[PDB]
Amino acid sequence: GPLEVYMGAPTQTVSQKLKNMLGGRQPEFRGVVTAYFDGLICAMNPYPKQWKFKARRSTAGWTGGVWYPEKCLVKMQGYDGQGNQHEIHAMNPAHILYECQSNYEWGRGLSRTLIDDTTFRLAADTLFNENFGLCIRWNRQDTLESFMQLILDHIGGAMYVSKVTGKLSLRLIRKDYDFDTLPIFDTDSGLLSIQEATNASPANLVNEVVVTYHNPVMDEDQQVRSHNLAQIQNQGCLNSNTIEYLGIPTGKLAMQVAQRDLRAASTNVRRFTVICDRRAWNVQPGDVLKVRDPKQRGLTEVVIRVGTVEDGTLPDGKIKVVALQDQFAFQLNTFNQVEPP
């Protein structure tokens, strides 16, 4: 039979037949995707079957208009079935988060001016080049901060507020440092004390990760194994972890995220708690710096990622900087394309 599909346009109107069918006073269902199947065969008397649909969006349905539209279309090969292969149009997570804070239609809907645009351009810079998209779903809606937590974990970034403007901003945890321009911190250059001086025998860290993602073409969950052979060949029994990465639509990107996590959490994790004078007042969580304590603790001029920071008051001077060993970006190690039959 025929099928009327109304896309919920801002000034949408529907045929009177739908309202007669539903009867009585009826709305125009503006803003919502509503499908009307006037076909007489909904089913045979054997009870009707269940339905499914497939759609995608990049620019439609933006309260207040679209933002930075020329980098939202993250296409990538996400085929299910080798001979049935076809690319899928994943969305840019940067635009996902921008919508999360730039539309009143759900959540907070922060005004555009209070969102740091240049930071989301920064995010797009690497999200589009490496082709990290997403196909997440938000059924049975939950707290907004939890959904942003999920998205940030997928991208591996930090949502934060610019120190100067106060606008909401986004950061990504990547390899964006040249290990040359970084400032060197020792007691003679601003370091006051290393509040974390012990070593907790961190040799038996996680050595295997099971990444679970969701292929839209199959429209069901998929899984990827990643073994750090170096740790398995010496430590003995496994220290594995199954991690959730639903919404990632392909095996290539699933592998990228799995490798990122495995190399981040397995390779020489060391937490630095640093007492600092007014030498890092500009330093902001996520920044990078190099620390050196060669004559007391004998650590060899290591580069560290900046985490939590506790800015001081007009008295007491110092700032406490929680710092973490180097993180990593995506890269290619395994060839896990299952390529079903």
Binding site: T13, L22, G23, G24, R25, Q26, P27, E28, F29, R30, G31, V32, C42, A43, N45, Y47, P48, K49, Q50, T63, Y104, E105, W106, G107, R108, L110, L114, W138, Q141, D142, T143, L144, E145, F147, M148, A158, M159, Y160, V161, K163, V164, T165, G166, L168, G190, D277, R278, R279, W281, N282, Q284, P285, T308, V309, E310, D311, G312, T313, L314
Partner: protein, 271 residues
């Protein structure tokens, strides 16, 4: 030249200035002891004192706790009835002989509570990152639209349904005006009243009930005077018939009357 002085080992100057802002209603404070004047404004020396601009990514812990003297109008805005519009706090960090106070914090005034130290109250100011506990649950198909009246989706004109009048007589949690008498009962149920406060500027707060010339407000009364007109807006039952008759906005309605009683396609014979 700020950073050079700031990063020096044996050179520096103390200043921590505070800007309390409310739609450009300004208070310029200085934690130092002097009449600091910078950025084209005088930052008076007041007993304000920071407790640390913490940035951990964790809500509650990062709540900037300011010790603010109660006598200030800033705290005065929160005596009994706090402002209906958020107040923003900006901190700046210049030295002396310097003139670029690099801003360091743009949090908002969330809550205030006096206590054991009557000479200064505790002011809690988080930032946008930690205020994201919202329900998220918005659309939720129902027999009535979830749209908030006059919102971006209900889109009922803000001007077509104006009502305003000066207060005939203020009362305990109730107000009376001549214009309200001209309207039918419940015309303002879920509405709100609006006027201008010599300091708050715009003030908007809801109405819980209307009858004749009398109305009742969901919130408290921050003191009202029979001068300025109370720009009063009608509410809505939010039913399809309500949005149709009263507003003539049925074509822009988000509620589904014919939610088919969840007529299933399983379990029992149907169709």
């Amino acid at each position: 030249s700020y950073n050079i002085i700031e990063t020096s080992n044996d050179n520096g100057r103390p200043v921590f200035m505070y800007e309390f802002r409310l739609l450009d209603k300004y208070w310029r404070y200085t934690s130092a002891d002097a009449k600091v004047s910078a950025l084209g404004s005088i930052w008076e020396p007041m007993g304000v004192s920071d407790d640390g601009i913490k940035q951990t990514g964790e809500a509650k812990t990062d709540a900037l706790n300011l010790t603010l003297p109660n006598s200030n109008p800033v705290v005065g805005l929160f005596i009994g009835t706090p402002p209906g519009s958020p107040v923003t706090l900006t901190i700046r960090r210049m030295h002396l002989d310097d003139n670029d106070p690099v801003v360091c914090y743009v949090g908002t005034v969330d809550s205030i509570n006096q206590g054991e130290n009557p000479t200064v109250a505790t002011v809690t100011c988080s930032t946008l990152s930690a205020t994201m506990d919202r329900n998220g649950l918005r659309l939720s198909w129902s027999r009535g639209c979830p749209h908030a009246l006059y919102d971006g989706q209900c889109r009922v004109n803000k001007e077509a349904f104006r009502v305003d009048a000066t207060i005939l007589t203020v009362g305990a949690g109730t107000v009376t005006a001549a214009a309200y008498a001209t309207r039918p009962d419940g015309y303002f149920a879920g509405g709100f009243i609006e006027w201008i406060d010599p300091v708050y500027g715009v003030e908007r707060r809801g109405i819980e009930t209307h009858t004749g010339n009398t109305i009742t407000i969901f919130g408290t009364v921050d003191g009202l005077a029979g001068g300025y007109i109370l720009k009063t807006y009608p509410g809505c039952p939010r039913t399809s018939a309500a949005c149709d008759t009263i507003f003539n906005n049925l074509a822009n309605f988000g509620g589904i009357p014919s939610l088919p009683d969840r007529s299933p396609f399983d379990g029992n014979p149907i169709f």
